[PDB]
Amino acid sequence: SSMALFEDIQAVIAEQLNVDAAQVTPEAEFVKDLGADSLDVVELIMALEEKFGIEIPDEQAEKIVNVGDVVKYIEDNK
Amino acid sequence: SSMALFEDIQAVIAEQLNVDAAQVTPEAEFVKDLGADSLDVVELIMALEEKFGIEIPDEQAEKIVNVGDVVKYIEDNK
Amino acid sequence: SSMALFEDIQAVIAEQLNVDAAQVTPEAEFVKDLGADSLDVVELIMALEEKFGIEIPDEQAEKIVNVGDVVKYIEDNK
Amino acid sequence: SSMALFEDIQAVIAEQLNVDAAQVTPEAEFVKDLGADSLDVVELIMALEEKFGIEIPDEQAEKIVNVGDVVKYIEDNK
Amino acid sequence: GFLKGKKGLIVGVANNKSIAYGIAQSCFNQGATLAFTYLNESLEKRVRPIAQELNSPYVYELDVSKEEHFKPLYDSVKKDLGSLDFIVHSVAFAPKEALEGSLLETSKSAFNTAMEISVYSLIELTNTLKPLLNNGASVLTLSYLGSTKYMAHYNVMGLAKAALESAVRYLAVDLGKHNIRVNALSAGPIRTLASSGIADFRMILKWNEINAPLRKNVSLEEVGNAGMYLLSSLSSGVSGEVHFVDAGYHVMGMGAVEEKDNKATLLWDLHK
Amino acid sequence: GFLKGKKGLIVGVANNKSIAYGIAQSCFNQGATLAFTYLNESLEKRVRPIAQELNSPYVYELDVSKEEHFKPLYDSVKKDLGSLDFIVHSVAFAPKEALEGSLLETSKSAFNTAMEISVYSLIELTNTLKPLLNNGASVLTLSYLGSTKYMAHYNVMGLAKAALESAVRYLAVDLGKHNIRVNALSAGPIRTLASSGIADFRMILKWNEINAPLRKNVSLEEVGNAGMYLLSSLSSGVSGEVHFVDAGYHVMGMGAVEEKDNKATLLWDLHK
Amino acid sequence: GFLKGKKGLIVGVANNKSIAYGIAQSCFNQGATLAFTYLNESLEKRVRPIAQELNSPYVYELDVSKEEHFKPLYDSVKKDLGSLDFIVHSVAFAPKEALEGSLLETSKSAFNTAMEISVYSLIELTNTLKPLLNNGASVLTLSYLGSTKYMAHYNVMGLAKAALESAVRYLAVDLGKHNIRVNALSAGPIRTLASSGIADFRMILKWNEINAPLRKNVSLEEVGNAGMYLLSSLSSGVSGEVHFVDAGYHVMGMGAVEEKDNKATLLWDLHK
Amino acid sequence: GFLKGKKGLIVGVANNKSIAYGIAQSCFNQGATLAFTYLNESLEKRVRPIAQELNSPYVYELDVSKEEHFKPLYDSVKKDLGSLDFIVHSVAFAPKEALEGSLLETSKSAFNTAMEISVYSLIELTNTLKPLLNNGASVLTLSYLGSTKYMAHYNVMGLAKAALESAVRYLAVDLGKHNIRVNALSAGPIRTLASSGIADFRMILKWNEINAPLRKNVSLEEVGNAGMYLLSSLSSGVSGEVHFVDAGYHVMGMGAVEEKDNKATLLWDLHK
Numbered sequence A, B, C, D: 001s002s003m004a005l006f007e008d009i010q011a012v013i014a015e016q017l018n019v020d021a022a023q024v025t026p027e028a029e030f031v032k033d034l035g036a037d038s039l040d041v042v043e044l045i046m047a048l049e050e051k052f053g054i055e056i057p058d059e060q061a062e063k064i065v066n067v068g069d070v071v072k073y074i075e076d077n078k
Numbered sequence E, F, G, H: 001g002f003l004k005g006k007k008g009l010i011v012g013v014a015n016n017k018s019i020a021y022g023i024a025q026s027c028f029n030q031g032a033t034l035a036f037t038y039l040n041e042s043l044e045k046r047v048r049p050i051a052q053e054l055n056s057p058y059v060y061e062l063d064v065s066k067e068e069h070f071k072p073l074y075d076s077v078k079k080d081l082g083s084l085d086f087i088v089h090s091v092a093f094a095p096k097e098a099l100e101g102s103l104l105e106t107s108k109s110a111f112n113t114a115m116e117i118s119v120y121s122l123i124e125l126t127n128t129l130k131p132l133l134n135n136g137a138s139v140l141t142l143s144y145l146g147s148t149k150y151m152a153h154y155n156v157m158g159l160a161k162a163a164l165e166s167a168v169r170y171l172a173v174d175l176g177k178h179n180i181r182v183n184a185l186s187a188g189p190i191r192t193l194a195s196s197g198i199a200d201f202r203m204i205l206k207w208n209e210i211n212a213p214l215r216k217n218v219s220l221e222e223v224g225n226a227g228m229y230l231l232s233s234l235s236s237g238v239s240g241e242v243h244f245v246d247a248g249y250h251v252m253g254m255g256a257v258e259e260k261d262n263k264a265t266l267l268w269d270l271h272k
């Protein structure tokens, strides 16, 4: 992962879930490790695609589970 | 009750519920003694008001229970 | 005509057509003598029926031509 | 012009305007020489595009005036 | 005969005053092979003789609230008919208490009953029988002006008919790509056995008769002919439509008038 | 035959692709005694042979902009037929320039032509022939979805059809008390001789075919059968109605979709 | 103030009971710079004082049947205002004879007058003033339920309002790509100076009052506030809309009822 | 400020993209005393801060599927506010599986959930709070064009919105005699948190943007201002209305076109 990209995605996830950046690591998962319900995630997804002008399709949206997934996805499509 | 009126009402009730006229007596009741469901009665009521040009209002319709009721009602309103 | 009624109707006609009360006499006619178009009259009629709670029907409305007509009409119907 | 194409277009024009094939020559014009109103032409145009599966656009439709035009057009687009 | 050789399932006959019967009868006069369903044994007594009269041995049980009735109905139709060219969904229900007073009073359970019985059953019936429909098949349901305009005491059943007309639109899209049509016939008020469940139906019927353009209530035959039309290939360009058979009543924005050279008067104000 | 012995006047045949012809032909197959009118001599050439084919000697001149043609048309019908059971008003016109570009560009004279020819002629024709109508008579006009929804370049003709549908409602009231019915058939786009006057009709026709529930354009036969229905006693409870015969297209609030398990796609986006 | 600094042209003030006045007054209370037009000198007498009261020196001549008045009106607005943010088209006319009796009786010339004055003038006025409209401009016209439902004696004016509502849809498309909005406000009956030209308006007004959901006629202020809304940026997502300001009357499919524990009764049947 | 001193209960805020929030915010800018409800504790986290921002301590629990929540909500409003001048019902739900594929696939339980949550809750909420409503109170719900036209995959939620709009009509009658108004705001598609539950919402949003008269999607502010209007005394003559706030999209009967002097082209066909 590109470090500038990860850090910028990390700030979004941090602010969105009101966690500390420190807890936002590539392995972390929104439901399990980050305390996100079905709304938090959907809100977070929109924040990301709105930020990055791209759009995560719904089929690709489900298959996301961890910070790495959203990062590796966004880097491949920005 | 007027005998011509009763006999004419009796034929209607007979045909409607496919019972013998003999079983249609003023005391008889459509649900209990005549084997009529909620449809039989409603169908029978329409047959009567259609026959007699009058209309049994719905409030008066419920309060009917026995052959005498429909007969005494119809005689008072025809 | 009742003098209280005439004077009260006269004030309405005066104000409505912005003429002097003096020119509002029972013989006067709205089109000829009072300088009223088709609007002035219709506006004036509504002012009258609104004032008097009555309603000049349209058939009776046409047949009016002079101050006396509206006065004699209103007195008969108030 | 391809002779098979011309002859086949000529039969259509013939039948459509109920003229003899002989009068249908490349120089002939539908309004002047062939006696066609605004309907005849529009009907004839549809007959042609329906026959040939192509569609004469309306802009190209106006610019047609003579048998040669429809023939040279159809050959270029079939 | 415009339905000669065409197979159709009539759902909702209660007696010979049922809208379903009028439709079934009109289709019969056009040569249709009919099959019928009945709610329970109390209703089998009435369906099966009428079916007989319309020359039909095919009489099946269908209570649309019993999920378990639908697979048997499918099997019966496949056994006895093999395929269907049309389906008549002529069925609705709401508890007495909901068809009177206000909408605000309605219970959640009355709501759910009105919606399940009157709307969802079109989905489950059409989904169940979809594999057996022939090319050009035609699905018909029955609605009422109370869906898009206020009608007295129609309350939760107006809500159901609004959904029902919306279901017709979506089903027409779903099924149209398989060349199947779906329509609603919106009848005017007509004295039937279920329509007695509506508070002061009689006054609604009168208001319609006085104020409809044609100054008549619709006849059972008129609804049946309109239905037959929508079921038949005559209407093979019609889908997603809500077809008013109401003596023209839907056009009225107000009571009808009539003039005595003097005023105008409401027609209603002449008889009493 | 559902119009056996019934007399009807067909107004608007131009050729055998005219909507009026489809209707006339469907009524013929139902046993109707037809009579026809023609705009001028250029059109008499086309009407009178088609009339012949539908077994009719009654062919009269009617340019609806000529007030003086209507009394003769009345006299002709009284002489030759004596009475009418139905009338088909299948007529509209607007100058080319108005059926393209914007509504804002429209000339007052184009406006007046579209309104007189396309709407007012229903009034003058029905008023003229009203004394000759039999009990149960049925008056039919032809409309288009462009009346209540925006359709490309339909412009002043949308205004005319909106009025026309409103005229149907008022005429249904006027005539219903004499037990006469008045309806509009709202056809989907169909390749006719006048419809070529609409800018990029072809694309409107395609958009309809792709996006209609039934994924087809309507056939001339389908409009004729629907018309026949509305003219016939089958629809004797139908008045004031705007009856869509458009392959279901009116229900669509958006382009049709189809799914590839992945996204949804507009059907339009598949062919190009 | 929601129209502070916004320039608008009010067409149709006749007196302080005119719908146009209510709208103009509501816009004034929201800070609008108004300009007004008048039919002729008889009407200039009434417009110019009311304009004064709403703080306006801009009073121009516009008889919409005079093609030659429109270029001067353009020049006047450009001189005195330079640009417009909204336009109120509050204008209609039909000869007395047409607003009574039947539609069948209507003369071609009455028809043409109703259509030109009541519908086409929106086209010519909006086309004329289109170059002067600012970003976000809002064009408002006035309609009536008689357009899509039958109302007593409304006759040719129903035809005009149907076209008018259709014009709103097409104009909304034409002008929307330039970020200009076009709407109709469909008022309930309200006692105005032109509304006295309708046969038995009074009874239509009563029928509305008794049978509207809110059991009241609408007030001139209520129409003006609704209009102001549609003219203001508050409604900047609203276009092509027909907005009912009628005490809810449009929802009624029948006379209102009220129950005495016994029967139901028409409200109409209580007062007489 | 048009709601100064007026008390209102906002039901349905999820975050600051919720339609309910836009409405609440517009009402705040007009001086309203607001109170809010939340589905559960997961949603209380989001409502209670937003309420704070709109200057509100009144934050109550309401899961509309819990009959037992309504009496407490009544008591809370009576304690803290005493009376209400308006209510915003901005709430709908359906399981994911129903907002995709066909209507035919829909489960009875998905149907019942969509109807209970999205329609019946307006009845129970308005019935519960009816004793606390002031003179002139205004009840607002939220609908979508999918109610009366087909929209892709909207399926059972179209059925719910059709019923919902019908409920608005009946409730407007029920409540209008107590001088209470009931309306629906029919928003265009807008990216919200629940709207992500619709299959290919994004494409519906694009189709709207390209093809709406105003060539834009509606903004959250535009829905809020329209809502505020309907809640405020500005609309005190408006009841039973379905008010489109959709950039004009409802008027389109087909894709938008644009001309290159040559053909016409669908706008959709320009970007890809």
Ligand SMILES: NC(=O)c1ccc[n+]([C@@H]2O[C@H](COP(=O)([O-])OP(=O)(O)OC[C@H]3O[C@@H](n4cnc5c(N)ncnc54)[C@H](O)[C@@H]3O)[C@@H](O)[C@H]2O)c1
Pocket: E011, E012, E013, E014, E015, E017, E018, E019, E020, E038, E039, E043, E062, E063, E064, E065, E090, E091, E092, E093, E117, E142, E143, E144, E186, E187, E188, E189, E190, E191, E192, E193, E194, E195
């Ligand atoms: N005025 C009218 O009579 C009128 C007007 C317009 C529309 N409709 C509609 O016409 C349709 C038929 O009604 P009708 O007036 O002919 O009354 P009806 O009583 O003749 O028909 C009603 C049918 O619904 C059946 N039904 C009820 N619940 C059922 C269930 N759970 N499972 C299977 N069947 C069930 C009844 O048994 C009966 O067969 C309904 O949709 C009704 O709403 C009636």
Ligand SMILES: NC(=O)c1ccc[n+]([C@@H]2O[C@H](COP(=O)([O-])OP(=O)(O)OC[C@H]3O[C@@H](n4cnc5c(N)ncnc54)[C@H](O)[C@@H]3O)[C@@H](O)[C@H]2O)c1
Pocket: F011, F012, F013, F014, F015, F017, F018, F019, F020, F038, F039, F043, F062, F063, F064, F065, F090, F091, F092, F093, F117, F142, F143, F144, F186, F187, F188, F189, F190, F191, F192, F193, F194, F195
């Ligand atoms: N897509 C369509 O073709 C379509 C769709 C819906 C509705 N319509 C309507 O169907 C009706 C018939 O049109 P069509 O498509 O069959 O076209 P068409 O050309 O076959 O019929 C038009 C008829 O109008 C006649 N006409 C025109 N002006 C006349 C006049 N002044 N006096 C007498 N007759 C006159 C024409 O001569 C012709 O007979 C019209 O109302 C049309 O608007 C057409």
Ligand SMILES: NC(=O)c1ccc[n+]([C@@H]2O[C@H](COP(=O)([O-])OP(=O)(O)OC[C@H]3O[C@@H](n4cnc5c(N)ncnc54)[C@H](O)[C@@H]3O)[C@@H](O)[C@H]2O)c1
Pocket: G011, G012, G013, G014, G015, G017, G018, G019, G020, G038, G039, G043, G062, G063, G064, G065, G090, G091, G092, G093, G117, G142, G143, G144, G186, G187, G188, G189, G190, G191, G192, G193, G194, G195
């Ligand atoms: N019940 C109602 O009053 C009611 C209800 C709904 C809609 N409307 C519509 O509201 C609009 C205004 O009518 P109103 O009721 O306020 O009546 P009004 O008399 O106050 O307004 C009518 C205006 O039209 C103007 N006008 C007529 N012909 C004109 C012309 N040729 N050129 C320029 N101006 C002309 C009149 O002079 C007057 O200014 C009309 O569209 C009317 O149809 C009225």
Ligand SMILES: NC(=O)c1ccc[n+]([C@@H]2O[C@H](COP(=O)([O-])OP(=O)(O)OC[C@H]3O[C@@H](n4cnc5c(N)ncnc54)[C@H](O)[C@@H]3O)[C@@H](O)[C@H]2O)c1
Pocket: H011, H012, H013, H014, H015, H017, H018, H019, H020, H038, H039, H043, H062, H063, H064, H065, H090, H091, H092, H093, H117, H142, H143, H144, H186, H187, H188, H189, H190, H191, H192, H193, H194, H195
């Ligand atoms: N495109 C759109 O977003 C759009 C367009 C038109 C209409 N609408 C309608 O607007 C309204 C609000 O939706 P939104 O788009 O703002 O989405 P949203 O997610 O912001 O609002 C939905 C609200 O419904 C609440 N809710 C769901 N189930 C509930 C329950 N059982 N009890 C209490 N609350 C419950 C949700 O928690 C949330 O607060 C709905 O009626 C929706 O159908 C939305």
